[PDB]
Amino acid sequence: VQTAEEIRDEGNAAVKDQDYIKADELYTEALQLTTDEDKALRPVLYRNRAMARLKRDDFEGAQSDCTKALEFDGADVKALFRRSLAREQLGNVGPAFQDAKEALRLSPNDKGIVEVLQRLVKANNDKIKQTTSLANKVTDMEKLAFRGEAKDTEQKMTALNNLLVLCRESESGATGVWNQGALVPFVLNLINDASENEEVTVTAIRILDETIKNSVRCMKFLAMHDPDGPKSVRFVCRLMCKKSTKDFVDATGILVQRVFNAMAKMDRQKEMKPDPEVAEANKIWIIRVLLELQEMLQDPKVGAVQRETCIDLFLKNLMHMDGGIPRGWSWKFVEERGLLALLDVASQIPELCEYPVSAETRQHVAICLQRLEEDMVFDTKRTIFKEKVDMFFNALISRCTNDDEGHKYRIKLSCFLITMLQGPVDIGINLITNDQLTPIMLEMAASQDHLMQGIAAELIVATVSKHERAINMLKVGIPVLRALYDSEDPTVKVRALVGLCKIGAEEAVISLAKTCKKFLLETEKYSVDIRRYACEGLSYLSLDADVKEWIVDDSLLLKALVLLAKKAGALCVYTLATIYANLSNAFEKPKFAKHHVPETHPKDTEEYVEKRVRALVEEGAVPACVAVSKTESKNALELIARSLLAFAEYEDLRGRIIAEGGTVLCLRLTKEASGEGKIKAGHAIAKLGAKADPMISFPGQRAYEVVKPLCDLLHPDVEGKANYDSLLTLTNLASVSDSIRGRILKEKAIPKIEEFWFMTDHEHLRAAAAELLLNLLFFEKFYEETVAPGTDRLKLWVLYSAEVEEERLSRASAAGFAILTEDENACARIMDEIKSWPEVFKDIAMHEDAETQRRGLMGIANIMHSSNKLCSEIVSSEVFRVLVAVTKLGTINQERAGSTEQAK
């Protein structure tokens, strides 16, 4: 059991530990425990979650939790504060004052309340004055973009991006482009126009996309299309149908997405696990939505693309056990039409579909059923679930009679199993065991009907796996593949090449290779879906060194394996990933006797991997990655991840793999890719950024994004990784451009980069450990942060400068000595709080570093040029000073002749 009470303390403590993500969750979760008979026990909480939320930028929340607390006590200065603090952030300074103001007089003195009000004051002033300044900025383009009045595409387009830029650029500008809904009908018009260029339309959706990231605005959007609520919810979803190009659909879905995020106060990209109360509040809308996205899971009128979407849309927002809606939805979804009907799809194909479907439509339904599975937890549940997939398998099977028509059913019950196997595999394998399936397997497998012929050779190819208990139906099935293999019908031949390729120890390991080879290689002739398997096959023949070498050995197999991805898209991910991931050895394995003789395979061990990775990344290998990379897979990502990570460890390579959407991908990977996915993808990011110019790799704010990762990847500093590769990055990042360092800082990441300094046997990881900080304090924020305070910093920018038994560590803390000197308060914290200061100043004085005896003589010269109690000090050091005064090469006499200057 658990008590309302204590649980809070758990969060209270979290708030203090700095896990607001936790705190938020803990409080909210705690809040659930109590009720409306434990009065005071609650308000306290709203107040506190609001604290954390405010800390995690959940402003709309902070505010709502805040006010939810005042609900009890008018006073609650704690609340009024946070609220106004939040409100002012939502760009709404108005009542931001009346809270902060009222707060102040409740807690008469409070450097905080005051600090805010000072701000809010300068705020309400530049309010009306400034809003009607934007409003115009807006209405001026609202003409160009929408309201007719604009000439030539180009401009109408630009005028849009602006609204978009201006839209998300500030919580304010958003409300500004929203123009109180004016935006909706204008965007809808671009949608409804048949001719309007796609991009135009997409861009205009993306403006709206953003606008509705606001729960209230969004929740308005949903209901705003018809007096009858339910009807409106239809309209929104069904927007993705108006048109039907890849992007138009995609860009649209997000709109639907927002509706979820808004409805249950959740956001998967922020890790904002839904507030149980909100969802529960406006629950009625969450019903209507799913219901609709579900009912269109089958409407034959609903396109394919759109279909695939309502599935992912379904996936991402229903699985409570994963960034989803609260618990309980996923259940009533299987307890009713949902599951069954989500299965009804699992048994469809592009060659027999009761409602539009595409080659890709499977993946989406696999993983999606796989998660609906996982998102079940309870036994009482898992039961009611299998006691359904089963109630399905029955009705479906007991209808597979042998006859022209009935045969349809075997294709269904068949595919229905090829999926169920790729998805919730357990419920799937635990299905082909009731061999009542194996006969039909044969029946069709031997008939004349090329289809049943092939999709039977695939209902097995898709049952290979690992263990047994299922090698029952495999027993007879493998041979069958051998027979079907002979077939002249390519489709049935290939679909047989797999499995018979996916086993191993006519079927020679090489044989099966030369097969998928010409099978594939044969571009112009053999179709695409044919080679989708030829790719899958070869893929299994890539876990053996020998073959790996053979593959890459032939250009045409790369030039084409690429060309395929550049067309098959997310249909060759799991596969082409394992091909690109295995020839690079991107896979990691845990690390009297012997067995070292077998760990050989020189084609695997040694820089023989590089041989491959080289001419491999030569033949696309990257363009191919970005290609079949769009796929909420998880592992496929993780695959292209290591396929990149292990691609950017060769220098001259990343020189182009950067120009081939490199930075983009592994970056996307950061968010999308699961587990090691992000992890290994980020290392790729960091291990790409180094001997690379940040101007030609991280422009357009690409930078700002490339921080949360390699500033969270540093955290793991107990040892390992490319923490160092992550330094030459933040070093080549915080360097040119302020804003950059801004994040690096806001990252709450300094407590760690501040230790690549505190090292001994780590010369290298310290070399940049400093070169970074030079470009970090390189512009206030952290400059005034390192001087005034009184935290033993300056103590080292001086030692390191002199302590040059190596170098670098100097040149870094040297120009980090000269520029930190020009500040007066600096010359203070030192001299008085820097014992044996001369001795140090002495070494660095002319220390044979033909550089530090210039950055030292400057960070030394200016220590006296400012403040005279220091200008005095001529004890021992003032000697060397005179030194440089001849034709002794090293121009270090520069900051040298400057040291003397401070004598006047």
Binding site: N48, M51, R82, D110, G112
Partner: peptide, 10 residues
């Protein structure tokens, strides 16, 4: 010094 500077919960 402390934390009652309402940067603390309760």
């Amino acid at each position: 010094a402390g934390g009652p500077t309402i940067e603390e919960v309760d």
